[PDB]
Amino acid sequence: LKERGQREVFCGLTGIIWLHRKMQDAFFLVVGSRTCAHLLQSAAGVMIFAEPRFGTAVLEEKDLAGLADANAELDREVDRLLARRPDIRQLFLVGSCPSEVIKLDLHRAAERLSAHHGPAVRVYNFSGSGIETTFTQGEDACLASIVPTLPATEARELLLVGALPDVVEDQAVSLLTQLGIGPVRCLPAHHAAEAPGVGPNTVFALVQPFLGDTHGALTRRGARHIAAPFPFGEEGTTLWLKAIADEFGVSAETFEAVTAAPRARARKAVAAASEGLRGKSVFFLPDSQLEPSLARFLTRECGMSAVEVGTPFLHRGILGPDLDLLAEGPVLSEGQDVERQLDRVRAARPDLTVCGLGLANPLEAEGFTTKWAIELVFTPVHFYEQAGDLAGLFSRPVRRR
Amino acid sequence: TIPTGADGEGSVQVHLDEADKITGAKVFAVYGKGGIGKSTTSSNLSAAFSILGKRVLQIGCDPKHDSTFTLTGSLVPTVIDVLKDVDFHPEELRPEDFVFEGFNGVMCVEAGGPPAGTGCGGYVVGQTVKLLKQHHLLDDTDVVIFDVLGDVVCGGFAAPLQHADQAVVVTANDFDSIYAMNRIIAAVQAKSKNYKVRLAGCVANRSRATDEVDRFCKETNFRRLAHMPDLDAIRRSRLKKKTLFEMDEDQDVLAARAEYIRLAESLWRGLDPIDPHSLPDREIFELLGF
Amino acid sequence: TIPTGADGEGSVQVHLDEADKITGAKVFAVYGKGGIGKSTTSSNLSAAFSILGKRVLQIGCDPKHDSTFTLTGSLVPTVIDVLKDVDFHPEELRPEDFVFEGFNGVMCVEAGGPPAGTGCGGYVVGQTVKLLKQHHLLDDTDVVIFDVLGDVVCGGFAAPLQHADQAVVVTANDFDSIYAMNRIIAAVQAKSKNYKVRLAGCVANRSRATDEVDRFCKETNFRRLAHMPDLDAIRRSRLKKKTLFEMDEDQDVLAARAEYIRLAESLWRGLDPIDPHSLPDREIFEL
Amino acid sequence: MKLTLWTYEGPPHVGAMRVATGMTGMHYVLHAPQGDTYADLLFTMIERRGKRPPVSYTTFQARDLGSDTAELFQSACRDAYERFQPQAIMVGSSCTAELIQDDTGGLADALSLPVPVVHLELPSYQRKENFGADESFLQICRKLARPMERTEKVSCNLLGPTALGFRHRDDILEVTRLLEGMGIAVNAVAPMGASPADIARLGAAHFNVLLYPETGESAARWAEKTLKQPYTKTVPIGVGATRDFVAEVAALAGVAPVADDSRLRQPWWSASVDSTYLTGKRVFLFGDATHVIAAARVARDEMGFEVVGMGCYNREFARPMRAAAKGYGLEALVTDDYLEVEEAIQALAPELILGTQMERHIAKRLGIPCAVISAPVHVQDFPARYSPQMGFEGANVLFDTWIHPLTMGLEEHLLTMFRE
Numbered sequence A: 001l002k003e004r005g006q007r008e009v010f011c012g013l014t015g016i017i018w019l020h021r022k023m024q025d026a027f028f029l030v031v032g033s034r035t036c037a038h039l040l041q042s043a044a045g046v047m048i049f050a051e052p053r054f055g056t057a058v059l060e061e062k063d064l065a066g067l068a069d070a071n072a073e074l075d076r077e078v079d080r081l082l083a084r085r086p087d088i089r090q091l092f093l094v095g096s097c098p099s100e101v102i103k104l105d106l107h108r109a110a111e112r113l114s115a116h117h118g119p120a121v122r123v124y125n126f127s128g129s130g131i132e133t134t135f136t137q138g139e140d141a142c143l144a145s146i147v148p149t150l151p152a153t154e155a156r157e158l159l160l161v162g163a164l165p166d167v168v169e170d171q172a173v174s175l176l177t178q179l180g181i182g183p184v185r186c187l188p189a190h191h192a193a194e195a196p197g198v199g200p201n202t203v204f205a206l207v208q209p210f211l212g213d214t215h216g217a218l219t220r221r222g223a224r225h226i227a228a229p230f231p232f233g234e235e236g237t238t239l240w241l242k243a244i245a246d247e248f249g250v251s252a253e254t255f256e257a258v259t260a261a262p263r264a265r266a267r268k269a270v271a272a273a274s275e276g277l278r279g280k281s282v283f284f285l286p287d288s289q290l291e292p293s294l295a296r297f298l299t300r301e302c303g304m305s306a307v308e309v310g311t312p313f314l315h316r317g318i319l320g321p322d323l324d325l326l327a328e329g330p331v332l333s334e335g336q337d338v339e340r341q342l343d344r345v346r347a348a349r350p351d352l353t354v355c356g357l358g359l360a361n362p363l364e365a366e367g368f369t370t371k372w373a374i375e376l377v378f379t380p381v382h383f384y385e386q387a388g389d390l391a392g393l394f395s396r397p398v399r400r401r
Numbered sequence B: 001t002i003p004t005g006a007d008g009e010g011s012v013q014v015h016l017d018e019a020d021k022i023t024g025a026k027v028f029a030v031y032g033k034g035g036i037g038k039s040t041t042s043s044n045l046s047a048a049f050s051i052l053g054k055r056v057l058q059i060g061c062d063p064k065h066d067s068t069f070t071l072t073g074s075l076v077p078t079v080i081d082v083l084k085d086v087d088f089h090p091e092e093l094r095p096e097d098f099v100f101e102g103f104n105g106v107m108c109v110e111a112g113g114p115p116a117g118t119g120c121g122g123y124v125v126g127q128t129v130k131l132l133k134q135h136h137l138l139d140d141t142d143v144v145i146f147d148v149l150g151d152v153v154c155g156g157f158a159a160p161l162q163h164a165d166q167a168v169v170v171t172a173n174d175f176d177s178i179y180a181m182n183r184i185i186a187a188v189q190a191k192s193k194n195y196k197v198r199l200a201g202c203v204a205n206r207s208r209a210t211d212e213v214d215r216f217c218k219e220t221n222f223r224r225l226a227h228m229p230d231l232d233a234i235r236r237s238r239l240k241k242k243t244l245f246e247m248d249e250d251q252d253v254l255a256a257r258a259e260y261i262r263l264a265e266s267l268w269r270g271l272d273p274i275d276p277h278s279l280p281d282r283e284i285f286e287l288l289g290f
Numbered sequence C: 001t002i003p004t005g006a007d008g009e010g011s012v013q014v015h016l017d018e019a020d021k022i023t024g025a026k027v028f029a030v031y032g033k034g035g036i037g038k039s040t041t042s043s044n045l046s047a048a049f050s051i052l053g054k055r056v057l058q059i060g061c062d063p064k065h066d067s068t069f070t071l072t073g074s075l076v077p078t079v080i081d082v083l084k085d086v087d088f089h090p091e092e093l094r095p096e097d098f099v100f101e102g103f104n105g106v107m108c109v110e111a112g113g114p115p116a117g118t119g120c121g122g123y124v125v126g127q128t129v130k131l132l133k134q135h136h137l138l139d140d141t142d143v144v145i146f147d148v149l150g151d152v153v154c155g156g157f158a159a160p161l162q163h164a165d166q167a168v169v170v171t172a173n174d175f176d177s178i179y180a181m182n183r184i185i186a187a188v189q190a191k192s193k194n195y196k197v198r199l200a201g202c203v204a205n206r207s208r209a210t211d212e213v214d215r216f217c218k219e220t221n222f223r224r225l226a227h228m229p230d231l232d233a234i235r236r237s238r239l240k241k242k243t244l245f246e247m248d249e250d251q252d253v254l255a256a257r258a259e260y261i262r263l264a265e266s267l268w269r270g271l272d273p274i275d276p277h278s279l280p281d282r283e284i285f286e287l
Numbered sequence D: 001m002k003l004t005l006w007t008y009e010g011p012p013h014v015g016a017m018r019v020a021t022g023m024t025g026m027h028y029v030l031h032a033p034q035g036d037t038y039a040d041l042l043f044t045m046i047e048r049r050g051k052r053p054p055v056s057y058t059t060f061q062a063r064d065l066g067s068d069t070a071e072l073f074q075s076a077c078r079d080a081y082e083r084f085q086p087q088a089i090m091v092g093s094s095c096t097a098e099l100i101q102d103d104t105g106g107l108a109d110a111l112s113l114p115v116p117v118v119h120l121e122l123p124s125y126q127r128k129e130n131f132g133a134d135e136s137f138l139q140i141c142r143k144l145a146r147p148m149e150r151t152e153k154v155s156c157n158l159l160g161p162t163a164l165g166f167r168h169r170d171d172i173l174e175v176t177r178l179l180e181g182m183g184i185a186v187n188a189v190a191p192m193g194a195s196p197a198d199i200a201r202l203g204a205a206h207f208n209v210l211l212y213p214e215t216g217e218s219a220a221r222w223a224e225k226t227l228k229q230p231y232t233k234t235v236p237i238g239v240g241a242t243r244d245f246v247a248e249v250a251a252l253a254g255v256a257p258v259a260d261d262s263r264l265r266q267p268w269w270s271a272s273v274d275s276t277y278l279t280g281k282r283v284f285l286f287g288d289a290t291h292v293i294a295a296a297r298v299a300r301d302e303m304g305f306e307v308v309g310m311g312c313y314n315r316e317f318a319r320p321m322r323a324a325a326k327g328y329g330l331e332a333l334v335t336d337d338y339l340e341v342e343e344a345i346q347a348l349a350p351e352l353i354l355g356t357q358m359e360r361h362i363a364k365r366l367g368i369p370c371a372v373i374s375a376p377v378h379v380q381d382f383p384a385r386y387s388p389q390m391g392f393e394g395a396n397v398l399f400d401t402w403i404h405p406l407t408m409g410l411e412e413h414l415l416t417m418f419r420e
């Protein structure tokens, strides 16, 4: 079901909103019109009041008429903003729809910009516009842009890749050290405080399902992905760490015994909320490519019944273990016209609906409970600690009516 | 190449030929009102310098034949003064072969009627300036005259005032006049950074008793000079045939040609600049003002 | 390489003039050289059209700021004056703060001449028409009339022809006016090459009609729209700040108003616009 | 090309979508890129709308360029007509659309659908959102608002109230109750409660009421000549402005003033003895044009405050802004940048500042009491409780809304001094 009649998604510029949270040494210059500025501003909400690192310079008629004018204005503006923020070192010239239609070559501009700025301050660009990407594609485009700049390493190290809340990263490091074997290098390192060397030696695993261009970036270095269920829910995290153990030759008994208490706490937390969502139907809409893992977790751990799962793009090569864990019940789908999937929603009568915020209130008025997928990227749902809170996010035992 | 800025960067409308302040050779512009406004002043004054001994590149810039064809007798006798050509020359590009050698001095021509059409005056006369320069006519002559009209005030189109230094004035005695002379004054101090084109004084022709417009001209801090003429000028048909210096000296009220010589006695470089100023529509009102 | 230089023919061949050909209403640009009556003819034409019942706005592109001045009777603050009062941001202007109404509700706009020694008249009229679109006065109005100095017809001077659907001309018996009309036809043909501007015809300058201008129209394949001499009946000084069609009546006034009414209705119809030519300068019978 | 971190407005298509969703029976087709679809979030959520905004987007991508954009647009309009069934349809363009050689008007004409369509030419890089709302309003008015015979009873039209407006749902109610106060009937409320039939009947009013200038002024002026419809000039925000507006409408309609002062309490509470300390308090105002004008008038006259800073992001109304600022002997600050107004409130250091969300948050950073009196707001500013900003009730709302920050800070300071 790949009908293109009408689509309701977000630009990858929405990735900048929480992407800058991982690295506080990243400034983002958006070559976008007033509309993209309004999108970033609205979606960020209370951020803009705290001076973020999102610089969305409007393409006025003056610099949009020509091409090189914007190119020189880019250098002038980055010099300005480096003066404003001496702390800032990493710069990203994110692509936007006006830049794509005017075909502004951001790559050469970023290269000469880094050349003139020098080694201390380094600028790498990518394109997060909605013309060629969508929503979550911005983040893996960004990191794949910074992958080649990372030096090759000759040491076999356990690799974590993916923007993630800092407490979740710390707990994952703690768990993998509790495993005992596998040095962890954080590719989205905090404010680039440790430039993570990536080369053929470092075999990697994936924590965030949507990271598509990430795999290509790490195959260019030579790293290989390992088939591992994405760490959603207690069993998802358990099978993930089991996969890491298998790759690094960790004894099954050792890792089973080591992680007993954390997964006991996780099963307690998940059973605390499992009883809420027993024996209901759910419908998934294409929001952030995070839906198939969610469907697996809900269906097998929370007793959910998944009617449909809508994903804008399926990277089956990496989502394969997820699909194998996933039941045959829910119909997989790569990009469904919003009205068509809306018709299927009306037909299916989903007790719970996962979709964008824009659709959410209309479905609520139609009488269907809605859970907006724009939230779960922000809130931590990614491991044992948040295994219970993942289900709690879908509990919604409102039942006011 | 300059794609933007030519009509971009705020729609800049300079001639797009850097600075044109440099005088051709001591350029002595002559303003006017489009043929009927005594554009023969440029040709006659060029003839005055030539008789003195200073060759003039009197550039009439008149699409119709009133400015310099009087000096050059027949209009465009080879039709190579028309100046509009894809090859930028309707004949061989040799400076000597290019157009005629006027009729006194060494060599001198005007601008013809260009069918160039599309294009700002920054180039329409902006290019028209430099074909004489292209074959070094401004170098081949001792002094230069760069005639302009009342319509030309605006820069780029006012490239003759870009190149002019010591100019005399010609105007009427009506509301169109009191508008035109002060607007030209505005144009020339706008071109004051372009080799300080002078404001020597106006050949104003009072029709019958328009002493009030002449009083206004005085209020513009601006001298009167040829006050006497009352709509009476030299024979028009013979003037078309040849300019006054080549034609019978038919003075109308006073010693017109002797007045020209008396002016040229200090105007060989330029009459003493009265240094006038432009004036607003509030004071320059002409009561009703047509 | 001296002629082409860095730009040379650049700004005049490539990006010669921005298009923005949004007319909506019927446009007739009156083109005269000077002395021959273009502004007075345009004002009386606007008055006659308002008499007919068509909404009329007049754009005084002439830099003397007197073309539409007669209809109001008081000097109109030109557009550039307000654009300088504002910080050249076209949005704080509002209707009736730059446009003004004349007799019988005739809208009129004056385009202030570009600053002496810099800028462009085409630039100026482009800003006037853009500001005009911004507050959408063309949308309500039915007839749009342009008054421009036809003595110079260069690219910026030819900007109103881009808008004008029909090009009205005025002429006198003087040979300078003859060369002027010839140049005007040539330039109007050039402007009708890019997009289109049709040739409505030429009228007399009230000096003497059909003395030799009619034969010139026949030679150039042009037409000679009828107009009558009223040199002394119509006071040269705008009849006490007030045109004839606006605040006066008399036998000569009535008949001149009738002539302008015929011009108005003919322009309103404006069918079968002639496709004339420019007769050679040497071929021009001269004196 | 200037770096902006927070802007006070949106792209003009946002205002056009505001007017589109305000009135029913319309559908709004964007030539918008995929992902520019976010704009319905704010409507579904900030305004808390139960219905999907009546909009459809083509959502073109890199693969769809040239002809594919036109075919996608045609399919989008066709399916919008077939499944949404709008009585009126209009065609619009986004920022990226005009850069591509896609003719919205040509595509609409090629569709040749029976329902009338209008082509909205939106200068998305020259202008901003309120202008877009106003242009859509005048364009729809000339499309399907034609002059027609007057009503039996004197009727008025409220022009200006659009969606995403400040309190607009409440101002329409307050103005309507007042006009029923003189008994004059409101023939049509647009664009907040408009419909194709309502726009058709818009010419039936005996006069128009400009409830909000930025979104109805050009429509009122179009009705001035097209429909011979006079429109009121005074905005009734504040007691004195309410009386001026009452006199104006009574004059236009010819009915007696019959003003009801029964529910008003703001003058007595401002002259109340507990309100003495408000006198001589400096205030800075920024935001929507008429909102700031009325706020300054109300402050200086009825509140006892001294207006110490005045400004407006609505550049199209800088002339009234400057006129009022000179009237108070101030210096209008017309910047659209948060940093300039930030510096202004730093230098002036007013006791209280009343602007929009930016002003609220910068005052929070500066430790200054603040209230919101302008359009750009978050979700919680729009209340479920009816909070008219205009009329006699609006006077009391404005009063205590301004009071709350002051009394909060004052009692906090009293606590701090007292435990010390």
Ligand code: PMR
Pocket (backbone or CB within 6 Å): A014, A017, A018, A039, A042, A043, A044, A045, A357, A372, A374, A375, A377, A378, D038, D041, D042, D045, D046, D379
């Ligand atoms: C472009 C869509 C959009 C808009 C208009 C807002 C403002 C808004 N942000 Mg949701 N924010 C959008 C998307 C996002 N906001 C984000 C931040 C955020 C959070 C965590 C939350 C939030 C909320 C809102 C709200 C309240 C209304 C709403 O639910 O959209 C607006 C207007 C609020 C919520 O969803 O309801 C409880 C909430 O918990 N904004 C993030 C970062 C993950 C994204 C991608």
Ligand code: SF4
Pocket (backbone or CB within 6 Å): B013, B119, B120, B121, B122, B154, B155, B156, B157, C114, C119, C120, C121, C122, C123, C152, C154, C155, C156, C157, C158
């Ligand atoms: S003559 Fe007029 S139109 Fe031509 S460049 Fe000068 S100002 Fe512009």
Ligand SMILES: [Cu+2]
Pocket (backbone or CB within 6 Å): D408
């Ligand atoms: Cu509070």
Ligand SMILES: [Mg+2]
Pocket (backbone or CB within 6 Å): B040, B066, B070, B236, B239, B240
């Ligand atoms: Mg002569």
Ligand SMILES: [Mg+2]
Pocket (backbone or CB within 6 Å): C034, C039, C062, C064, C067, C149
């Ligand atoms: Mg004139």
